């Protein structure tokens, strides 16, 4: 038996991953309840991950795979769920700190995500191209006055991820984005049939909300 396609919700500790699920829901294998909001209207599953670094590997593995399917346990009888998209959630308020530490740890996680998918696109011992799996970079907590707006978030990540691929090539496959690219932009990931877009929103409090996110996603699965 099979289930609705699922969207991998990944991001660092404290982004609001666990928070967003409940909203989604309230409207290693994975143990999701196939209930109401995803079922009744959203026709896909939102799959939560752990935030800690020690645990990122399992999340990353799914991303290497040319045709990723997730094994889910509803609330015995195991299912498979076609991985069709990814939501990269981060705390946009914590990003604002002058020290620049949040951006660094966060851009590192984000790097491996896009590069994993990048390897997955190239990797073809099966001769056909692998299916497009878009990543949505969701800048959460837009209700806080101190939260960084989505357009800055977009720009800040590119500069760090570009900084990352630069510092590593100076290690004289691990190169994110195009090989001839002079400065990094998410738009150049289109060359590997992966769509990456930064979008702001919030789960609790007063602001943009989360439906724009889901609308992006549902428009893409
Ligand atoms: N201000 C604000 N706080 C949020 C929002 N979403 C989540 N949080 C809080 O930020 C923290 C993030 O925690 P959590 O959901 O456990 O994130 P996780 O570590 O990634 O699983 C929690 O205390 C949430 O209550 C939001 O939209 N706005
Ligand atoms: Mg959590």
């Amino acid at each position: 038996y099979t289930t609705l396609p699922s969207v991998l919700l990944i991001g660092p500790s404290g982004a609001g991953k666990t928070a967003l699920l409940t909203l989604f829901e309230r409207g290693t294998s994975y143990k999701v309840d196939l209930d109401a909001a995803g079922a009744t209207a959203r026709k896909f599953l939102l799959i939560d991950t752990p935030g800690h670094p020690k645990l990122r590997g399992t999340t990353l593995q799914h991303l290497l795979n040319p045709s990723p399917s997730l094994t889910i346990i509803p609330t015995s009888d195991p299912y498979k769920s076609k991985l069709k998209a990814v939501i990269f959630l981060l705390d946009a308020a914590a990003l604002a700190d002058s020290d620049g530490d949040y951006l660094s740890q966060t851009a590192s996680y984000l790097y491996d995500v896009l590069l994993s998918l990048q390897k997955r696109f190239h990797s073809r011992k099966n001769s056909r191209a692998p299916s497009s799996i878009p990543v949505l970079i969701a800048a959460n907590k837009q209700d806080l006055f101190t939260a960084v707006p989505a357009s800055l978030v977009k720009s800040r990540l590119e500069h760090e991820l570009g900084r990352i691929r630069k510092t590593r090539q100076k290690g004289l496959e691990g190169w994110l984005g195009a090989v001839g690219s002079k400065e990094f932009k998410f738009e150049e990931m289109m060359e590997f049939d992966m769509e990456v877009e930064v979008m702001g929103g919030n789960v609790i409090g007063d602001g943009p909300g989360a439906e724009r996110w889901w609308r992006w996603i549902g428009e893409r699965i």
Side-chain angles (χ1 to χ4, degrees), residues 58-77:
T58 333
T59 292
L60 291 176
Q61 172 63 35
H62 304 295
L63 298 179
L64 287 341
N65 206 277
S67 200
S69 66
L70 282 174
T71 309
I72 152 231
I73 307 178
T75 49
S76 52
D77 278 325

Side-chain angles (χ1 to χ4, degrees), residues 17-18 48-51:
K17 308 202 292 314
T18 318
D48 198 355
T49 66

Side-chain angles (χ1 to χ4, degrees), residues 7-11 20 44 46 84-90 110 113-114 117 133-140 150 153-154 157 186 194-201 209-221:
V7 180
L8 209 52
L9 165 62
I10 61 191
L20 180 67
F44 75 92
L46 194 68
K84 280 189 171 307
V86 165
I87 294 178
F88 193 74
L89 196 58
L90 61 93
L110 178 57
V113 166
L114 307 173
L117 288 163
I133 293 170
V135 171
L136 173 64
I137 300 175
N140 198 16
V153 166
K154 176 172 188 134
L157 290 173
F186 284 115
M194 53 196 300
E195 167 181 17
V196 41
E197 171 170 359
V198 175
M199 191 166 301
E211 283 307 324
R212 300 215 77 242
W213 288 335
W214 291 324
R215 183 153 53 252
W216 192 95
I217 287 302
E219 223 159 62
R220 276 138 181 110
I221 60 180

Side-chain angles (χ1 to χ4, degrees), residues 197-208:
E197 171 170 359
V198 175
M199 191 166 301
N202 68 288
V203 176
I204 64 178
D206 280 324

